[PDB]
Structures are given as C-alpha cells and as structure tokens.
Amino acid sequence: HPIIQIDRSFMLLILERSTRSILFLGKVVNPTE
Amino acid sequence: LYKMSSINADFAFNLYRRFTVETPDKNIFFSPVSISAALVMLSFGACCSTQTEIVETLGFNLTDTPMVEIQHGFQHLICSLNFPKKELELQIGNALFIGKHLKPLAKFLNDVKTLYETEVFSTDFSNISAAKQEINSHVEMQTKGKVVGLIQDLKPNTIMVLVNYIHFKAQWANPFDPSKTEDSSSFLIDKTTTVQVPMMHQMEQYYHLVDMELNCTVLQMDYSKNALALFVLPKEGQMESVEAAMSSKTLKKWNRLLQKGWVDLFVPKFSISATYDLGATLLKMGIQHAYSENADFSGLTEDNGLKLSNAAHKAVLHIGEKGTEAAGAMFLEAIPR
Ligand SMILES: COc1ccc2c(c1)c(CC(=O)O)c(C)n2C(=O)c1ccc(Cl)cc1
Ligand SMILES: [Ca+2]
Ligand SMILES: [Ca+2]
Ligand SMILES: [Cl-]
Ligand SMILES: [Cl-]
Ligand code: NA
Ligand code: NA
C-alpha cells in the first residue's frame, strides 16, 4: 500500500460540509515553533 | 451559499498568499471565515464606497451578487455553522464593544443581534486598560480558553471594538492509536534541518490523490461529523508552486479526483499559533475609505463619527490522536473620525 509520510512542510485546510466553508487554512513549516 | 463558497475560498487563498510574502517560510495559520465574517459585519453599518470596498475586497462582484444577497448569505452561513450537530463542537459569533457615548442605530444593533450572532456590550473606553482586559477575557471565554491575549494594544482614543470568534473541536472518523505514535521522529523544516516531533501512524483507507499537475500529494481525513481535514504535501522544492496554484478551482478539481484506498499514513502530533496585524494588509487589498477621515459608517451610528484604525487576528491549532481543536478571533478597532 502507498506510504504518505507528512514529514516536511505541508498546507492544511479544515472544511465544514453543510456550507462548504474553509474554517481554517495554514502551512506548517516547523511544528515545534 | 455555493457561490459564496468559491468566493470565500478564493479570498482565503489570496490572503494566504499575502501572508507568505509578509512572513516567508514561516508557519501560517488563520480562520478565513472569522476574518470574512467580521468584515461583513462591519460592512452592515457602512454605506456607498466604504461598503462596496469592503465586500469587493472580500471577493464579491456586486453585479453578480448584490449587496443584500451578500448580507443574507453571510447571515445564513453563520446560522448554519452554529446549528448543533452531534460529535462536532463548532461555535462562531461576534461581540460589539461600543463606547458608552456613541449613538448606535437601532437598525444596526437589531441586525447584528438577531441575524448575526452578536452580543452587544456598552463599554467605558475612558478606562482603556480595563476595556482591553475585558475584551481579551471575553474572547478567551468564547474560545474555550484557547485564544488568549487577542488585543495586545488598544489606541487611547478607541471608541468601538468589533470581535469575531470561532472555536472548533472534532474527533477523527478514524482516530490514531497512541501506542503506534513514535515519540520522536524527524520532520524536515528546511533542506538541512530537522526537528523532532511525535509521529502518529495508521494504515487505513483514506481519500487521497497525487496531483500530476501541481506535483503534490493530497490526503483527506474526515472528522466524525460534518467536517474534514485536507493535508497538501508538495514534492520537494515545490511548495511555492503549489501555493501559487491554490484556488477554488483547485479545490473543485480535488473534490472530483480524490479516491479512497489503503494508505500507510504518518501524521505529526503538534500545536501551533499565529498572529497577524491586518490593518495595512486590508488597506492594500482595497479597504481604503473605512480608514479615512471621510469613512461612511452612516448605517452604524447617528453622527457617523467613527473610522476604522486597526485590525488583527490570532489563531491556534492542535492535532493529535483523537482529533483536532482549533480557534481563532478577529479584532477591528475604531476611533473618532
Ligand atoms: C477532496 O477535496 C475536497 C475539497 C473541498 C471540499 C471537499 C473535498 C469536501 C468534502 C466533500 O465534498 O466530499 C468539502 C465539504 N469541501 C469544501 O468545503 C469546499 C470548499 C470550497 C470549495 Cl471552492 C469547494 C469545496
Ligand atoms: Ca470558505
Ligand atoms: Ca483505523
Ligand atoms: Cl469556501
Ligand atoms: Cl471561508
Ligand atoms: Na454617534
Ligand atoms: Na460594560
């Protein structure tokens, strides 16, 4: 099965279904900042 | 609401890209709905070009979506987001701290309270330090303790503050087993440097894609009800190109393409926070008359005697094995015109 390793910079979206809204948006460069 | 979806998403990504310029190669985290919702509230009290600038800055075209439809749509958004759903904590609302001597219009106060989830507090801004503390503690309460110290400084001539808050807490549809979390695993922060983070691990069926155009992996993780997370992992060296591509169009393409199948998934457990001073950014984006000596907030107070002076946002995020908690708040400050 394919591996997905989130071990470098990534963008994140948190979405709500009923309104199709972006609740939060970001980029994680350093998760321990 | 569907049209509002694409427009609000594209505002989110345009503001995101402003932040990648202001704080380059740094963590970014914000609630675009919180910022959009605050500014639309402010626009309910605005008239003529002051009003049109705000909604045009938010991405609306007044030929396609007239001002009253924008207003209606955001009122419907805020209602829907707050409608109770089992296994999801999601609150979004607003507070208006209004100077004890201002003369707000019955219409504006009735609009915000009844149709926009707003609490109204008569505030004595002659005690600025006490008002700042009051406002920060209210936001801290409304965010379940998560957004502390929203307002670092208030201008001494402040006469009104508008705050929007959002709080979200949800469980993963497929939680991680903490016995499979690796206590210290490497996360690459730049080409030659790693940091140690706890790395969660699960092999599960997830919707996922490799975008063959944008050179990135996209991984969908659902919350148990009414919400999902998207993780966008660019190929090495490709973050800027992915950032430039992100749009409503991209999201609609992913919505079609993602396919559910087995994935051996590693995700960090972590917390981050971010703060933004938005006054100058919003001016650059097109909100100009609101700051001016000729601001038109005729719909807000009898004497139209206020202008916007400052704007700021703070947002926080935690991801772990059970799910996600996130919160945000947006502050708009006004002074005598
Ligand atoms: C797999 O990629 C996506 C992308 C966006 C999505 C979704 C899934 C789902 C979940 C789903 O539809 O299955 C929702 C609810 N999304 C949105 O909120 C959304 C927001 C703005 C726009 Cl412009 C388009 C869609
Ligand atoms: Ca949105
Ligand atoms: Ca599982
Ligand atoms: Cl959206
Ligand atoms: Cl949004
Ligand atoms: Na007045
Ligand atoms: Na008071």
> Hey, what are B13's tokens?
């990504």
Give chain A's length: 33
Per the listing, tokens 């009735």 go with B110
DSSP A10: E
Please state the domain extents for chain B.
1-172+269-337, 173-268
Residue B270 to residue B326: CA distance in whole angstroms: 12
Topology of the domain covering B1-172+269-337: Antithrombin; Chain I, domain 2 (3.30.497)
> Hey, what are B267's tokens?
């995700």
Nearest to B143 by CA among B282, B281, B31: B31
Beta bridge pairs of residue B273: B316
DSSP A33: -
Do A14 and B275 touch, CB atoms closer than 8 A?
no
Beta bridge pairs of residue B266: A5, B201
Do B206 and A2 touch, CB atoms closer than 8 A?
no
Q: What is the resolution of this structure in A?
A: 1.6
Ligand 1 atom, smallest distance to B251 CA? 4
Q: For residue A19, what is the domain's CATH number?
A: 2.10.310.10
Extract the annotated binding site of A for thyroxine.
Answer: 17
Residue B141 to residue B148: CA distance in whole angstroms: 9
> Hey, what are A2's tokens?
């394919």
HEC letters along chain B: CHHHHHHHHHHHHHHHHHHHHHCCCCCEEECHHHHHHHHHHHHCCCCHHHHHHHHHHCCCCCCCCCHHHHHHHHHHHHHHHHCCECCEEEEEEEEEEEECCCCECHHHHHHHHHHCCEEEEEECCCCHHHHHHHHHHHHHHHCCCCCCCCCCCCCCCCCEEEEEEEEEEEEECCCCCHHHCEEEEEEEEECCEEEEEEEEEEEEEEEEEEECCCCEEEEEEEECCCEEEEEEEECCCCHHHHHHHCCHHHHHHHHHHCEEEEEEEEEECEEEEEEEECHHHHHHCCCCHHHCCCCCCCCCECCCCEEEEEEEEEEEEEECCCEEEEEEEEEEEEEEC
Identify all chain B residues contacting A4, using CB atoms and an 8 Å cutoff: 206, 208, 217, 219, 233, 263-266
A10-13 long-range Cβ contacts below 8 angstroms, 24+ apart: A10/B231, A10/B232, A10/B233, A10/B234, A11/B231, A11/B232, A11/B234, A11/B242, A11/B243, A11/B246, A12/B29, A12/B229, A12/B230, A12/B231, A12/B232, A12/B317, A13/B229, A13/B230, A13/B232
Nearest to B337 by CA among B75, B213, B157, B208: B157
Residue B216 to residue B238: CA distance in whole angstroms: 8
- Reported as half-sphere exposure (CB side, CA atoms, 13 A), residue A10 has a value of 21
Amino acid type, B239: M
Amino acid type, B3: K
Q: In CATH terms, is domain B173-268 a member of 2.60.120.620?
A: no
Dihedral, B36, B40, B41, B45 alpha carbons, nearest 10: 150
Nearest to B295 by CA among B34, B35, B45: B45
Q: Which domain holds residue A5?
A: 1-33
Give chain B's length: 337
> Hey, what are B22's tokens?
């202001």
> For A22, phi and psi rounded to 5 degrees?
-85, 105
> Hey, what are B105's tokens?
């219009």
The number of folded domains in chain A is 1
| B9 Cβ closer than 6 Å to some ligand 1 atom | yes
Exposed, middle or buried: residue B46 (CB in 10 Å: 0-12, 13-18, 19+)?
Answer: buried
> For B224, phi and psi rounded to 5 degrees?
-65, -30
Nearest to B230 by CA among B258, B204, B196: B258
Which residues are CB-neighbours of B211 under 8 A, at least 6 positions away? B217, B218, B253, B254, B257
Nearest to B259 by CA among B316, B213, B209: B209
**For the sheet containing B270-277, what is the strand order?**
B118-123, B88-99, B160-171, B323-336, B306-319, B270-277
Per the listing, tokens 């148990």 go with B224
Per the listing, tokens 């990648």 go with B20
Which residues are CB-neighbours of B249 under 8 A, at least 6 positions away? none
Nearest to B135 by CA among B156, B152, B118, B110: B152
Q: At what angle do helices B2-22 and B67-82 cross, to 10 degrees?
A: 90
HEC letters along B155-177: CCCCCEEEEEEEEEEEEECCCCC
Do B228 and B255 touch, CB atoms closer than 8 A?
no
Amino acid type, B19: F
Per the listing, tokens 């996360």 go with B187
Do B314 and B147 touch, CB atoms closer than 8 A?
yes
- Write down the experimental method used for this entry: X-ray
Nearest Cα of chain B lies from the Cα of A18 at a distance, in angstroms, of 7
Nearest Cα of chain A lies from the Cα of B112 at a distance, in angstroms, of 20
Beta bridge pairs of residue B329: B165, B314
The answer to whether B239 contacts A2, with C-beta atoms less than 8 Å apart, is no
Cα–Cα distances in angstroms (integers) from residue B159 to residues B99, B102, B104, B139, B336, in the given order: 5, 8, 12, 18, 7
Do B143 and B323 touch, CB atoms closer than 8 A?
no
DSSP A19: T
- Distance from residue A3's CA to the centre of ligand 5 (Å): 31
- Distance from residue B7's CA to the centre of ligand 5 (Å): 8
Do B109 and B244 touch, CB atoms closer than 8 A?
no
Beta bridge pairs of residue B265: A4, B202
Residue B24 to residue B125: CA distance in whole angstroms: 37
| B255 Cβ closer than 6 Å to some ligand 1 atom | yes
| A13 Cβ closer than 6 Å to some ligand 1 atom | no
> For B19, phi and psi rounded to 5 degrees?
-65, -30
